[PDB]
Amino acid sequence: MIIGYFDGLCEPKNPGGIATFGFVIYLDNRKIEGYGLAEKPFSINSTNNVAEYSGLICLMETMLRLGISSPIIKGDSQLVIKQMNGEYKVKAKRIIPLYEKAIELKKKLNATLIWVPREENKEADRLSRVAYELVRRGKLRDIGCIILT
Numbered sequence: 001m002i003i004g005y006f007d008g009l010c011e012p013k014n015p016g017g018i019a020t021f022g023f024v025i026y027l028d029n030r031k032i033e034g035y036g037l038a039e040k041p042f043s044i045n046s047t048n049n050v051a052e053y054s055g056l057i058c059l060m061e062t063m064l065r066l067g068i069s070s071p072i073i074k075g076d077s078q079l080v081i082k083q084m085n086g087e088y089k090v091k092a093k094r095i096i097p098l099y100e101k102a103i104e105l106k107k108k109l110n111a112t113l114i115w116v117p118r119e120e121n122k123e124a125d126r127l128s129r130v131a132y133e134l135v136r137r138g139k140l141r142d143i144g145c146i147i148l149t
Contacts, residue, residue: 002027003072005116006059007124008038008051009132018135019046021055022127025063032066034058034147035131037140045094052077053098055124056084056113058145060105070110076121081113 008021018041025032038054039046056075063071075081082088083099084106090099106113118125134140 001070001072002063002068003074004059004063005121005124006052006055006073006075007121007128008048008053008055008077009125009128010046010048010051011132015047016042016044017046018042018132019048019051019054020128020131020135020140021051021058022124022129022131023055023059023062024123024127025059025066025068032062032147033127034062034145035127036146037131037135037143039143041135041141047094049077049079049092050094050098051128052080053095053102055128056080057098057102057105060102060109060111061145062147063109063111064105068109070112073111073113074116074121075113075124076116076118078115081115084113 004025006023010019019038022035
């Protein structure tokens with residue numbers, strides 16, 4: 001089985017800050033890293049949960065594109081994980097579309113989502129920060145997934 005991690009952040013304020021994300025996929029002898037921007041910088045729609053859902057979505061879309069199946073997905077966002085696993089309801093208008101897309105990917109991948117403490121998700125956190133810094137430098141300005149070669 002393959003394991004992947006996802007993270008998202010929104011600084012310096014939430015909502016209304018810069019929302020970026022990061023993810024990592026661990027293959028047999030290779031590590032795939034990615035990150036990105038989740039919403040317009042300093043937009044009212046920019047929130048931590050939007051960033052976290054976006055990281056989850058990019059992680060799963062990448063796994064699907066690669067042909068990975070039945071993976072284990074880990075993250076420290078209990079909010080996202082509990083909504084995805086059906087314990088928490090989703091009503092936030094901005095979250096609804098992200099949740100529905102994530103659910104379809106989860107089903108297509110037959111992925112299992114598991115929560116881990118923040119101290120165990122430092123890799124994906126590092127990537128979210130990389131994207132954050134690129135946004136501040138004007139080097140990241142499109143909403144979408146970025147996968148490092």
